[PDB]
């Protein structure tokens, strides 16, 4: 069967360089155009580069022109992508493809190689209360929570009242911000009649920075 | 240098038929071959249609492709829907040294009742404002299918910077959650009358508002 075996990639800082490789079996290289297509996390497919059977013709989109170089070694049945002057927006899974040029489609896809471009380093979170108020209450149930802002790397764990409060707790998956730092939130729904009688503390643990925060969440 | 536009998401029950459209902005859809790719969650894409309506070997005839020039669109139709068909689908066309993809359509094969999102919007905390920062927090939960889009407004004007939104993620009850954050300065927060987080799910919206004057 056709195989497209990818390697390379990894983590670099902005301005850095990486080389991707795609070794092929099951067809003769010099008979096919080959391409790279990438996909940023949660986003769509984006074509990166294409090269003809022989290397006589190369195409790039403007998004990578002057920074990325596609090449191939037909005697080794191997395709390369040299990525220079990398930036955070280049973070993506990169797929090697075999093309059928005369039919304008990609007929086989590699399993992908992850490339991460980031200057972020270990940083503990800034934890803020999300206080219950009349504006966060619906028909007798109040929502309260805590915001865990601007930490790196994952993960963070959140408990409430040292694990004694579990019913109604919802800790949301983190967002990766364009700053390169993560944020997440944890919310719990409780009876509004409990706001004057119960204490609510969110327990945040960010082991990568050796930080714990116990944040009291007081009603407004 | 055209665009291909697809719906954000579609859904149907097992055994039914669903269609995903792909509309070309400029030029004629029939001028260039359209192909379609299936991408299951956490997986690499595979081809399901090429040359407008041809199936690769190993792709069943439940998948079909068509072209409608009157609407300048291509369509992927999947009959006899099975759970394995749940995936994102992408259309593709080439022209003049450029390879264009549609934005992708999430296909859900319905395995439970649909549910509209619950939306809770929190204003910046006093602590964050006193630290010279401000974040609005829009928490979106309990929706199915797992596809939403999120837009923010400052007073009545769409916000185009400072927004961070997650992909939907499956909850332990098999519905979906997402969150969106709006970054403001404290002066920005205080100088507007209201902010809104607008969540679109299946073509209908749930919008929550918060006000600095509380």
Author numbering:
A (entry chain H): 1 to 52, 52A, 53 to 82, 82A, 82B, 82C, 83 to 100, 100A, ...
B (entry chain L): 1 to 9, 11 to 27, 27A, 27B, 28 to 66, 66A, 66B, 67 to 106, ...
What does the primary publication say about this deposited structure?
Next, we investigated whether amino acid changes in the antibody framework regions during humanization impacted the structural disposition of CDRs. Crystal structures of unliganded 85RF45.1 Fab and unliganded TB31F Fab, solved to 3.15 and 1.5 Å resolutions, respectively, revealed a strikingly similar paratope configuration. The all-atom rmsd between the two unliganded variable domains is 0.88 Å, primarily arising from differences in loop conformations within the framework regions. These structures also revealed how the variable region is optimally configured for binding Pfs48/45 even when unliganded (all-atom rmsd 85RF45.1bound/unbound: 1.52 Å; TB31Fbound/unbound: 1.25 Å). Despite this high structural similarity, amino acid changes during humanization resulted in electrostatic surfaces that are considerably different between the 85RF45.1 and TB31F variable regions, indicating the attainment of antibody resurfacing. In unfolding and aggregation experiments, TB31F Fab was found to have gained in thermostability, with a melting temperature (Tm) of 74.8 °C and an aggregation temperature (Tagg) of 73.0 °C, compared to 63.1 and 63.8 °C for 85RF45.1 Fab, respectively. TB31F Fab shows thermostability throughout a wide pH range, whereas 85RF45.1 Fab is more dependent on pH. In addition, humanized TB31F Fab shows improved thermostability characteristics with ~10 °C higher Tm and Tagg compared to its rat-derived counterpart.
